[PDB]
Design an enzyme around this catalytic site. Structure first.
Site, mmCIF file in Angstrom:
data_model
loop_
_atom_site.group_PDB
_atom_site.id
_atom_site.type_symbol
_atom_site.label_atom_id
_atom_site.label_comp_id
_atom_site.label_asym_id
_atom_site.label_seq_id
_atom_site.Cartn_x
_atom_site.Cartn_y
_atom_site.Cartn_z
ATOM 1 N N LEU A 98 15.902 18.041 -9.585
ATOM 2 C CA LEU A 98 14.589 18.197 -8.984
ATOM 3 C C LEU A 98 14.451 17.098 -7.920
ATOM 4 N N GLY A 99 13.387 17.141 -7.123
ATOM 5 C CA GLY A 99 13.208 16.121 -6.096
ATOM 6 C C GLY A 99 13.613 16.574 -4.702
ATOM 7 N N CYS B 293 14.270 14.940 -0.323
ATOM 8 C CA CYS B 293 13.855 13.545 -0.430
ATOM 9 C C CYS B 293 14.627 12.709 -1.433
ATOM 10 N N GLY C 72 18.009 10.202 18.641
ATOM 11 C CA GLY C 72 17.411 8.932 18.273
ATOM 12 C C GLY C 72 16.131 9.103 17.481
ATOM 13 N N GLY D 141 17.918 16.995 14.298
ATOM 14 C CA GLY D 141 16.729 17.515 13.651
ATOM 15 C C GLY D 141 16.964 18.276 12.369
ATOM 16 N N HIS E 45 5.335 12.780 1.817
ATOM 17 C CA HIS E 45 3.956 12.616 1.368
ATOM 18 C C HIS E 45 3.102 13.771 1.866
ATOM 19 N N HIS F 263 -5.296 -15.087 1.951
ATOM 20 C CA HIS F 263 -4.517 -15.978 2.799
ATOM 21 C C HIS F 263 -3.515 -16.739 1.932
HETATM 22 C C1 LIG Z 1 18.026 11.505 5.635
HETATM 23 C C2 LIG Z 1 16.548 11.862 5.404
HETATM 24 C C3 LIG Z 1 15.581 10.816 5.245
HETATM 25 C C4 LIG Z 1 14.199 11.053 5.022
HETATM 26 N N1 LIG Z 1 13.304 9.953 4.845
HETATM 27 C C5 LIG Z 1 11.915 10.270 4.616
HETATM 28 C C6 LIG Z 1 11.056 9.202 4.427
HETATM 29 O O1 LIG Z 1 11.381 7.965 4.434
HETATM 30 N N2 LIG Z 1 9.698 9.570 4.200
HETATM 31 C C7 LIG Z 1 9.214 10.871 4.160
HETATM 32 O O2 LIG Z 1 8.003 11.074 3.953
HETATM 33 N N3 LIG Z 1 10.099 11.913 4.353
HETATM 34 C C8 LIG Z 1 11.418 11.610 4.573
HETATM 35 N N4 LIG Z 1 12.292 12.671 4.746
HETATM 36 C C9 LIG Z 1 11.840 14.037 4.711
HETATM 37 C C10 LIG Z 1 11.481 14.601 3.369
HETATM 38 O O3 LIG Z 1 12.701 14.491 2.573
HETATM 39 C C11 LIG Z 1 11.086 16.052 3.390
HETATM 40 O O4 LIG Z 1 9.996 16.302 4.267
HETATM 41 C C12 LIG Z 1 10.623 16.635 2.064
HETATM 42 O O5 LIG Z 1 11.710 16.418 1.117
HETATM 43 C C13 LIG Z 1 10.353 18.079 2.088
HETATM 44 O O6 LIG Z 1 9.974 18.487 0.786
HETATM 45 P P1 LIG Z 1 9.780 19.976 0.416
HETATM 46 O O7 LIG Z 1 9.397 19.971 -0.991
HETATM 47 O O8 LIG Z 1 8.858 20.684 1.361
HETATM 48 O O9 LIG Z 1 11.276 20.470 0.705
HETATM 49 P P2 LIG Z 1 12.708 20.043 0.134
HETATM 50 O O10 LIG Z 1 12.606 18.650 -0.386
HETATM 51 O O11 LIG Z 1 13.643 20.254 1.279
HETATM 52 O O12 LIG Z 1 13.166 20.924 -1.063
HETATM 53 C C14 LIG Z 1 13.091 22.349 -1.128
HETATM 54 C C15 LIG Z 1 13.758 22.631 -2.450
HETATM 55 O O13 LIG Z 1 13.791 24.044 -2.787
HETATM 56 C C16 LIG Z 1 15.122 24.449 -3.139
HETATM 57 N N5 LIG Z 1 15.244 25.825 -2.734
HETATM 58 C C17 LIG Z 1 15.242 26.427 -1.442
HETATM 59 N N6 LIG Z 1 15.363 27.726 -1.458
HETATM 60 C C18 LIG Z 1 15.457 28.062 -2.811
HETATM 61 C C19 LIG Z 1 15.599 29.292 -3.508
HETATM 62 N N7 LIG Z 1 15.671 30.467 -2.877
HETATM 63 N N8 LIG Z 1 15.662 29.255 -4.901
HETATM 64 C C20 LIG Z 1 15.590 28.077 -5.574
HETATM 65 N N9 LIG Z 1 15.445 26.813 -4.964
HETATM 66 C C21 LIG Z 1 15.391 26.966 -3.539
HETATM 67 C C22 LIG Z 1 16.016 23.418 -2.464
HETATM 68 O O14 LIG Z 1 17.299 23.469 -3.013
HETATM 69 C C23 LIG Z 1 15.244 22.161 -2.548
HETATM 70 O O15 LIG Z 1 15.421 21.427 -3.764
HETATM 71 C C24 LIG Z 1 13.761 12.468 4.977
HETATM 72 C C25 LIG Z 1 14.728 13.509 5.120
HETATM 73 C C26 LIG Z 1 16.089 13.221 5.327
HETATM 74 C C27 LIG Z 1 17.032 14.412 5.457
HETATM 75 C C1 LIG Z 2 -0.525 -26.811 -3.333
HETATM 76 C C2 LIG Z 2 -1.720 -25.951 -2.885
HETATM 77 C C3 LIG Z 2 -1.529 -24.561 -2.649
HETATM 78 C C4 LIG Z 2 -2.564 -23.693 -2.232
HETATM 79 N N1 LIG Z 2 -2.283 -22.335 -2.007
HETATM 80 C C5 LIG Z 2 -3.361 -21.505 -1.579
HETATM 81 C C6 LIG Z 2 -3.050 -20.187 -1.352
HETATM 82 O O1 LIG Z 2 -1.896 -19.662 -1.495
HETATM 83 N N2 LIG Z 2 -4.145 -19.387 -0.919
HETATM 84 C C7 LIG Z 2 -5.443 -19.836 -0.725
HETATM 85 O O2 LIG Z 2 -6.319 -19.035 -0.338
HETATM 86 N N3 LIG Z 2 -5.725 -21.169 -0.963
HETATM 87 C C8 LIG Z 2 -4.687 -21.981 -1.382
HETATM 88 N N4 LIG Z 2 -4.965 -23.312 -1.606
HETATM 89 C C9 LIG Z 2 -6.291 -23.835 -1.412
HETATM 90 C C10 LIG Z 2 -6.688 -24.056 0.014
HETATM 91 O O3 LIG Z 2 -5.724 -25.028 0.516
HETATM 92 C C11 LIG Z 2 -8.051 -24.653 0.218
HETATM 93 O O4 LIG Z 2 -9.068 -23.868 -0.401
HETATM 94 C C12 LIG Z 2 -8.537 -24.784 1.671
HETATM 95 O O5 LIG Z 2 -7.534 -25.564 2.379
HETATM 96 C C13 LIG Z 2 -9.829 -25.498 1.824
HETATM 97 O O6 LIG Z 2 -10.174 -25.602 3.209
HETATM 98 P P1 LIG Z 2 -11.386 -26.452 3.703
HETATM 99 O O7 LIG Z 2 -11.413 -26.305 5.147
HETATM 100 O O8 LIG Z 2 -12.663 -26.126 2.971
HETATM 101 O O9 LIG Z 2 -10.864 -27.895 3.203
HETATM 102 P P2 LIG Z 2 -9.541 -28.750 3.501
HETATM 103 O O10 LIG Z 2 -8.457 -27.791 3.872
HETATM 104 O O11 LIG Z 2 -9.322 -29.549 2.256
HETATM 105 O O12 LIG Z 2 -9.679 -29.758 4.667
HETATM 106 C C14 LIG Z 2 -10.784 -30.620 4.899
HETATM 107 C C15 LIG Z 2 -10.275 -31.450 6.056
HETATM 108 O O13 LIG Z 2 -11.249 -32.413 6.526
HETATM 109 C C16 LIG Z 2 -10.695 -33.736 6.587
HETATM 110 N N5 LIG Z 2 -11.766 -34.648 6.273
HETATM 111 C C17 LIG Z 2 -12.469 -34.904 5.065
HETATM 112 N N6 LIG Z 2 -13.407 -35.813 5.175
HETATM 113 C C18 LIG Z 2 -13.362 -36.212 6.515
HETATM 114 C C19 LIG Z 2 -14.103 -37.142 7.292
HETATM 115 N N7 LIG Z 2 -15.098 -37.880 6.793
HETATM 116 N N8 LIG Z 2 -13.776 -37.282 8.626
HETATM 117 C C20 LIG Z 2 -12.780 -36.555 9.183
HETATM 118 N N9 LIG Z 2 -11.997 -35.607 8.492
HETATM 119 C C21 LIG Z 2 -12.415 -35.541 7.130
HETATM 120 C C22 LIG Z 2 -9.488 -33.698 5.669
HETATM 121 O O14 LIG Z 2 -8.620 -34.734 6.034
HETATM 122 C C23 LIG Z 2 -8.999 -32.292 5.725
HETATM 123 O O15 LIG Z 2 -7.992 -32.042 6.721
HETATM 124 C C24 LIG Z 2 -3.911 -24.282 -2.047
HETATM 125 C C25 LIG Z 2 -4.100 -25.675 -2.278
HETATM 126 C C26 LIG Z 2 -3.036 -26.495 -2.686
HETATM 127 C C27 LIG Z 2 -3.354 -27.975 -2.896
#
Ligand SMILES: Cc1cc2nc3c(=O)[nH]c(=O)nc-3n(C[C@H](O)[C@H](O)[C@H](O)COP(=O)(O)OP(=O)(O)OC[C@H]3O[C@@H](n4cnc5c(N)ncnc54)[C@H](O)[C@@H]3O)c2cc1C
Ligand SMILES: Cc1cc2nc3c(=O)[nH]c(=O)nc-3n(C[C@H](O)[C@H](O)[C@H](O)COP(=O)(O)OP(=O)(O)OC[C@H]3O[C@@H](n4cnc5c(N)ncnc54)[C@H](O)[C@@H]3O)c2cc1C
Ligand SMILES: NC(=O)c1ccc[n+]([C@@H]2O[C@H](COP(=O)([O-])OP(=O)(O)OC[C@H]3O[C@@H](n4cnc5c(N)ncnc54)[C@H](O)[C@@H]3O)[C@@H](O)[C@H]2O)c1
Ligand SMILES: NC(=O)c1ccc[n+]([C@@H]2O[C@H](COP(=O)([O-])OP(=O)(O)OC[C@H]3O[C@@H](n4cnc5c(N)ncnc54)[C@H](O)[C@@H]3O)[C@@H](O)[C@H]2O)c1
Lengths: 478, 478
Positions: free
Chosen positions: B40-41, B44, B191, B284, B334, B457
């Site tokens: 099946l499938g 795709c 292409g 195609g 899809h 972020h």
């Molecule tokens: C190399 C390649 C890469 C692709 N990459 C993507 C992608 O990244 N994203 C995406 O969205 N699409 C992609 N597609 C396209 C996608 O695969 C097709 O649009 C989709 O599979 C079509 O689905 P379908 O069910 O309409 O037809 P199909 O998947 O073609 O299947 C029809 C089915 O019916 C069967 N069948 C036909 N006639 C009969 C019969 N008389 N009796 C019994 N069974 C029968 C077949 O054997 C087959 O299993 C790609 C296609 C190719 C070739």
């Molecule tokens: C290890 C670590 C990982 C983190 N990872 C994430 C993450 O993945 N995602 C996320 O959303 N948040 C993350 N956070 C949290 C995020 O860093 C903080 O919420 C955010 O930086 C706060 O921003 P702010 O502008 O309110 O304060 P701050 O970024 O703390 O900066 C305040 C600034 O003002 C300056 N300042 C203070 N007082 C004075 C003053 N009197 N005069 C002049 N300058 C002053 C400081 O020196 C500083 O540069 C992480 C924090 C840490 C410690």
């Protein structure tokens, strides 16, 4: 000392601050940004998001090339070694290019970039003082006469009293990101995302990783099922978890070149000793306002050290807004950026908005873990009647083709309206796929709304499509 | 002759047919599916999407280990060579698992699976004939009396008159997917997406690839700018192109062990002699109805060989629907699935639906190329006034951290309504990111609607958010 005038002055150049500066300038404001560290991008770009994602990505590829190549038809008769110096270089170059990019954006948008420390001279003016070593720093103090001030001073690592953090043996995230050598044993205190990500990085490179976590389960914040499944695949990947265990103390043993640790099991208050060549202190992050001068003008600071604001980002002073990690909300970069933008749009049009019910969270491990919206624990605790829709990647053609099928997509909907309430994903590209749930959630789409959209084949995204089908009807491929 | 009764009988087990079977079963119909190939499938899963994606993914890794490892801190010394047998096995294993998977879906859903050839007995009866060397084929002819018949016979490779395909030296996509050795030279006629994907695969593996294309550009249906940029990065990866050039003839030469090709420069009307160890004929694909007995009952077939249908997938017979590659619309998997579901849903509630204006297209090269909606040429031809939003991955943080920045996201919006009309992407994960464009279009989202959704972020998806920001306003990081 010299006087200067601007319409808007941003204190802080991280995600919230530099994006707010760019936005204010695009909106027509004479804008200035004050940053003391020496580079823009804040925590995220310099010691956070960016460098950490660089190490994760490169460590993942090394892992793939080292143990997944042969089964893909690729024979390497040689050796596959990690070159720590180039590993670090790759990360440093990425940080270097990006920090340079921001400075270029500041130039293109005409943002005045003051390199120094910013503090309140009074409630209406900002003083910029020079930073000793920092080159490009102001020659003398600057007094900025400004109409609107935006505080975006960010955060800092939460210190562990009793633990001397030298970025060599006992490191913080900043130290972990620049390790010059792969430690034989990496013991990490805290099972937070930051800790887990660093754990994954190093175990991939040959470190024996131990995660000491106070709580029972890890993750803290993710959906129950996601949290357990995460700890599951991480352990399977080599990480050792010590749950319900509290790190007590630690100190570097220079003679033995090993960090002596002391933990205590909460389910027995039984103390224990451990060791590791490198100890990572990841007990969280907190707001940073040191040197701001907030105390001088009476700016409200809550009991958690956060600058209090209203729904419009205003402090007690209407012309002083606060955004990002220094204030309320999740401490994430994308959250910080939108607040910076919202605050500035408010200054321009009088209104702005941030949707705190649609901020995604992501851990960049492999598989990645991403989620947005409500978890199951939150829906239950709120008495919400909901239905679940789940689809495993093992049933996804693309995933199977990649010989990487770990994970699933879980959609939570309202049993009544069938509206999507939450999305949780653990998969090869969870972080990217989650954007789909964000769009659906933002528009209040239903599971059927997503299910009906034609998704390209064969893609991982089809799992998201089928998971929504399973929420209100039935999936086709499982 | 055996007799059976079924509510719905589907001819073809490809994406459109097997999904129709599953759906019909789920909707409470007594369902049967007839497939002659042995698995099946359809196209795709057995000789299309799946096999190609497998070769593309594995060859991509091979390419990465050869050229991208060092700069990422990974030292790979010694020869790095492809193991053709294992390379082929990795692909064959994924297909075997997926085909086996669909059969489990059939068992689970209680779909009657007939292995043999399906043909029209008359307007309301189909007979199943045993297939010569088909494993598990029906041992005796069957006559199925049915209420509703669904034709999904798919397509086949479009042959080139005068050139004999032997799947050894002169091959079609099927032969290319199973080459036993990497050809020193691989020359390709056409292409199109298929031709380009196979070219990318073997070029990465070491073949000197040459693409001969009749048109002035590649891609077939891509947006103008995308087609040009696509040719440029493929050319940069080693593929040689001969545009405005059509093949005239080709034949094997067992003496020199090569294929002798003759082509003609469309601009000069002059011919040239070419030579290659392997020639791929990819001019195609075309509809397939052979042995279906469509002529017996007089089904309407157009000049393109397609079975004509109405907007309801109905043939000239109300109870005979047609779907997939054998009929109208783009020949994609899809698209076929969607029609399969639509047809069946029409038989149940009396109405199905396929948005032909929102069917994505994707080339799985690297960077990937994906698009949905209108290209610039289509908008111009319609005299529609539109705006462009463009954001390069070189400006995206995640792309930078991954050291994979080739490409961009291009958003096309209506100048008056700012409604998104089309999206075109060339990037590392274009195929997945395009889903976002899918959701937006389906819901009539505007560029601003997407731009205001918080994207995690640091992710590649932020580039999709910024491209939209630029379309109706201004990007931040651009
Ligand atoms: C190399 C390649 C890469 C692709 N990459 C993507 C992608 O990244 N994203 C995406 O969205 N699409 C992609 N597609 C396209 C996608 O695969 C097709 O649009 C989709 O599979 C079509 O689905 P379908 O069910 O309409 O037809 P199909 O998947 O073609 O299947 C029809 C089915 O019916 C069967 N069948 C036909 N006639 C009969 C019969 N008389 N009796 C019994 N069974 C029968 C077949 O054997 C087959 O299993 C790609 C296609 C190719 C070739
Ligand atoms: C290890 C670590 C990982 C983190 N990872 C994430 C993450 O993945 N995602 C996320 O959303 N948040 C993350 N956070 C949290 C995020 O860093 C903080 O919420 C955010 O930086 C706060 O921003 P702010 O502008 O309110 O304060 P701050 O970024 O703390 O900066 C305040 C600034 O003002 C300056 N300042 C203070 N007082 C004075 C003053 N009197 N005069 C002049 N300058 C002053 C400081 O020196 C500083 O540069 C992480 C924090 C840490 C410690
Ligand atoms: O970042 P974060 O806020 O996500 O979480 C920090 C994590 O580390 C844990 N933690 C904090 N102090 C700890 C200690 N002394 N021992 C063990 N775990 C600890 C917390 O329970 C939490 O799961
Ligand atoms: O739909 P679709 O069929 O246009 O797209 P398609 O996806 O089938 O692409 C086939 C490609 O091959 C090219 N082609 C067809 N016959 C050719 C020939 N004789 N010589 C050289 N190139 C040839 C077409 O121009 C097109 O770009």
């Amino acid at each position: 000392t010299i006087n200067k005038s601007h319409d808007v002055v941003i204190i802080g150049g991280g995600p919230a601050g530099y994006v707010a500066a760019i936005k204010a300038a695009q909106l027509g404001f004479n804008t200035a940004c004050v940053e003391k560290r020496g580079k823009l991008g804040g925590t995220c770009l310099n010691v956070g998001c960016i460098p950490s994602k660089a190490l994760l990505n490169n460590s993942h590829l090394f892992h793939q090339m080292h143990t997944e190549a042969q089964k893909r038809g690729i024979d390497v008769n040689g050796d596959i070694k990690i070159n720590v110096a180039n590993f670090q270089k790759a990360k440093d170059d990425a940080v270097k290019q990006l920090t340079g990019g921001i400075e270029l954006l500041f130039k293109k948008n005409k943002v005045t970039y003051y390199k120094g420390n910013g503090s309140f001279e009074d409630e209406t003016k900002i003083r910029v003082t020079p930073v000793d070593g920092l080159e490009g720093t102001v020659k003398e103090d600057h007094i900025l006469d400004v109409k609107n001030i935006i505080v975006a001073t960010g955060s800092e690592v939460t210190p562990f009293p009793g633990i001397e953090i030298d970025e060599e043996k006992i490191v913080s995230s900043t130290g972990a990101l620049s390790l010059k050598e792969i430690p034989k044993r990496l013991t990490i205190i805290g099972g937070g995302i930051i800790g887990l990500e660093m754990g994954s990085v190093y175990s991939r490179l040959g470190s024996k990783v131990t995660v000491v976590e106070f709580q029972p389960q890890i993750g803290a914040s993710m959906d129950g099922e996601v949290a357990k499944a995460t700890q599951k695949f991480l352990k399977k990947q080599g990480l050792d978890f010590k749950l319900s265990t509290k790190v007590i103390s630690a100190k570097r043993n220079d003679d033995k070149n090993v960090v002596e640790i002391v933990v205590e099991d909460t389910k027995t208050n039984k103390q224990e000793n451990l060791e590791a060549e490198v100890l990572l202190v990841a007990v969280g992050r907190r707001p940073y306002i040191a040197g701001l001068g907030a105390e001088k003008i009476g700016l409200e600071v809550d009991k958690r050290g956060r600058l209090v604001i209203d729904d419009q980002f205003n402090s007690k002073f209407p012309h002083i807004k606060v955004v990002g990690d220094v204030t309320f909300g999740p401490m994430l970069a994308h959250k910080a950026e939108e607040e910076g933008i919202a605050a500035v749009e408010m200054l321009k049009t009088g209104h702005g908005h941030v949707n705190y019910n649609n901020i995604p969270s992501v851990m960049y491990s492999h598989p990645e873990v991403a989620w947005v919206g409500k978890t199951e624990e939150q829906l239950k605790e709120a008495g919400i009647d909901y239905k679940i829709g789940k689809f495993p990647f093992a049933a996804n053609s693309r995933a199977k083709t990649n010989q990487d099928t770990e994970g699933f997509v879980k959609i939570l909907i309202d049993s009544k309206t069938e509206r999507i309430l939450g999305a949780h994903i653990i998969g090869p590209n969870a972080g990217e796929m989650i954007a789909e749930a964000g769009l659906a959630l933002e528009y209040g789409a239903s599971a059927e709304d997503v299910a009906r959209v034609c998704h390209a084949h064969p893609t991982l995204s089809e799992a998201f499509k089928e998971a929504n089908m399973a929420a209100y009807d039935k999936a086709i491929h499982c």
